[PDB]
Design a protein around this ligand. Sequence first.
Ligand SMILES: C[N+]1(C)CCc2cc3c(cc2[C@H]1[C@@H]1OC(=O)c2c1ccc1c2OCO1)OCO3
Ligand SMILES: Cc1cc(/C=C/C#N)cc(C)c1Nc1ccnc(Nc2ccc(C#N)cc2)n1
Lengths: 556, 416
Amino acid sequence: MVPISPIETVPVKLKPGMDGPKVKQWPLTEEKIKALVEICTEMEKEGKISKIGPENPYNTPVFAIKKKDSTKWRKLVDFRELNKRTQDFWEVQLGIPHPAGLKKKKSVTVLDVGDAYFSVPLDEDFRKYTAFTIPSINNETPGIRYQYNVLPQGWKGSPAIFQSSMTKILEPFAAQNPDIVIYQYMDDLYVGSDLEIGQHRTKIEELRQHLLRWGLTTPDKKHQKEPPFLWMGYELHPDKWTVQPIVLPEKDSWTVNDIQKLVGKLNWASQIYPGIKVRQLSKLLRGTKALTEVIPLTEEAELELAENREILKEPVHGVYYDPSKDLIAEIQKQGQGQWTYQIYQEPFKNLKTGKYARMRGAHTNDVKQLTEAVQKITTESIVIWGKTPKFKLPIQKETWETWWTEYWQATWIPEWEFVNTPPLVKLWYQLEKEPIVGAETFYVDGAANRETKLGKAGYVTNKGRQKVVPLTNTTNQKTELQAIYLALQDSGLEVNIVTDSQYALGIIQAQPDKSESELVNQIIEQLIKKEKVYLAWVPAHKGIGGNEQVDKLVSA
Amino acid sequence: IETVPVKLKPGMDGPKVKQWPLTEEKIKALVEICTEMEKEGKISKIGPENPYNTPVFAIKKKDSTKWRKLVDFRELNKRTQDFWEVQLGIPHPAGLKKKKSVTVLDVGDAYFSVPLDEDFRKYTAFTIPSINNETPGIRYQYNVLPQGWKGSPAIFQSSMTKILEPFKKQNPDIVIYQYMDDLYVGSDLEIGQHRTKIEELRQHLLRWGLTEPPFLWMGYELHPDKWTVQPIVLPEKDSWTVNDIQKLVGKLNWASQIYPGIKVRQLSKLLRGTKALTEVIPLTEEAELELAENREILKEPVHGVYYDPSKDLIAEIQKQGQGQWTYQIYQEPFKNLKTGKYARMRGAHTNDVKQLTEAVQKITTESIVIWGKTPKFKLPIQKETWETWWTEYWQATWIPEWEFVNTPPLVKLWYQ
Ligand SMILES: C[N+]1(C)CCc2cc3c(cc2[C@H]1[C@@H]1OC(=O)c2c1ccc1c2OCO1)OCO3
Ligand SMILES: Cc1cc(/C=C/C#N)cc(C)c1Nc1ccnc(Nc2ccc(C#N)cc2)n1
């Protein structure tokens, strides 16, 4: 006998105040019991489970399930109740590597470590909670009682404890062989390197020898799995990656479900297929959730879908990451709050692509959305590559400078350069810092009656120009905006406007270029036509003229 | 040498805070730092039966070339029991903010000399992430009092008081105040004399240590006796345009929420007509008198202003442009406890976000000196922008709480 090192147990507890499970065993057919008896006798021989005395008060139900197209049974232990009662664990598997962050490899070898899993012993003090009972034939004897000695399949702690145990075992091997990479997934180890094949094979044999120290054996007869790999919805190849085939179905009509699935595929595709769009399709799913409802596609959705089909007509692949090179991220505006990007190191060779959509909200502008996209890409890039890419953005340096220096919030985007690819992001208007000499001054006001919803909006000017318009089904806020709109409409290319609307100032000072409010959009359209606009605020009801006059005209 | 039992607050579990993404340089730095700390017995690797987490990152303190590990214990700090067993609390010294010079020392390394309650260690779990999650994050917990945890100064306090006694006894006029990993040391000595005393003080810690700290040597000098405040001031002009008067009436209307007897009636009558904004308007006698009366009111302190230690401090900041920032600290609206203005943002000429991050740190320091706690910030920045960048510019060993302001305040104009 060659001594093997035991695997250290992870200590496990139930949640505070909770006892173990006490769940009734279901009746089983005579045929199933005989099957289960055989399996457990075999499992017992192998040391996975042990017969226990009558003292243990816990129980978890066991089932026998027929393996389709076979006459063979499998055991299934239903640990749902124990799982609810078991502590939370650190789950190492939460974050999966993005293929775009991987490095090219010459060789990747797969080793089956399926035998090691049932070799991971269970914390001695916890075993009692895993007790289960094989019912007896005709219920004429006590059921056969067992508990687990190893990590049970289906138990809450098994994946985290298995993974952590394998990592600790593999640690010294990885540390002392810095020229390979090792990745565990389920019951397999993946071992990659750039060594000449003879040296790579030697490393695999050395890994096998290392693993034997804990008695974990692997099959001489090599894995059926070899590059390329199907993994987590991707295809991994030695020197490129892609998403698994994306096939958009033909349909005469689309249900809610069809559309959710369609958008899901497009979202998945968008990490390597450049320019994917989902706005108009996603708009169809707004608010409603009877999955069977049939939604007529809008013309816009039909256009988006056709554009996506064209994007998807043939395979596109990404390359892997070369740490010796800079990362570059380029962004384009697509319209309707949509943005698309590519991250590459060499021209025409993307590591990945992606998209960003405008946030929900009342008003917005392209510079703010571009800024948001940059932060999103920055954070994604730190995760995947550990560094911020250099940005190529469709905004002139002078535009950005004017924006950030004058914007009421602090704002920043990291190192970037202008790329002249339309449509360019620009500032559509900029308010004056000081009142304009020689420009007509419009004193504006609006008010509405909260009961009748009638209101008025208008202005008076230093030239004696005046206007009041009667409005129906309106509110104070809308009349305040209407008054500013009237002043913009009726003035020359330069204008001073005096308002008491805190609401309107708060909107305009946010510098929107688009709004959910049609009225705000009309104001923006007017601002775009002006050469100079100075917007002055004064407090209401303070005897402040022009304002006071217009208030009287509009509050009547 | 013996641990103080510590617990979380009733009905609370440990922190489970996500680790945010770290750059390659910071991961490599933390791996190097934690390997040494593990070797020194300060931290130990942990297994999957510990599900807790607190985020970690790395910074460079002001004027140093070495990376410092910084744990963001904000969540654990909220969840941790309060510490009143031995003492009700150290009355904050009101004399500290009156000293001519205050030097801030990093004394956090001293805490590592005290073991942490074995049953509490699990709640200090943290993770060093790997790039692209390619390898499992390296998981550790503390065996000793951690830097940045509110329990550390609380537990170490009896040890600190004993270490400093001869210095206090030899220098009875020095004010020493501990906040988290910081020691604040104030005197009225000529700086040269002051610095030598600071170095004298370091020698006690070093001496104690050896019976080696990476950052004790440093010294952040403050001069709170010179700290400057911001009363409300009105323009002095010979010629007022309609616009000037509108701005003045606006500012006064706002100030009238702070000061009761402020009046705008007579000034407001000036804005009655509908004159071009740039037209000059002569002040009436009634208006001049009202302006004069308002100026006199604004020279007095605000009525009914008091500090309540049971209430949060709130700090608001406005970007004024050209590297300038204004701020106010209050507990009740219109009852400012401190206001101020900065323009001296060091090495941040084309970066607003770095400037704001440095403003937040300066304001928090002022807050610690004056009241002995940190304010809750209202930051004029989008969440996503702040959260992407602030850790790049952070140099302090504590972290305050903050929320984001998404609608432009009109008030910015009045602090300008
Ligand atoms: C907490 N300890 C006792 C120390 C260090 C450590 C660090 C870990 C871990 C478990 C452990 C355990 C313990 O130490 C081991 O090396 C170990 C441990 C428990 C279980 C194991 C182990 O190797 C094989 O299976 O999971 C992943 O990271
Ligand atoms: C995450 C991961 C998944 C699989 C495999 C999962 C599955 N199924 C295999 C390995 C070895 C890794 N780990 C790493 C780490 C760094 N670079 C790489 N590059 C890399 C991986 C596979 C191929 C290929 N073909 C090429 C390069 N892989």
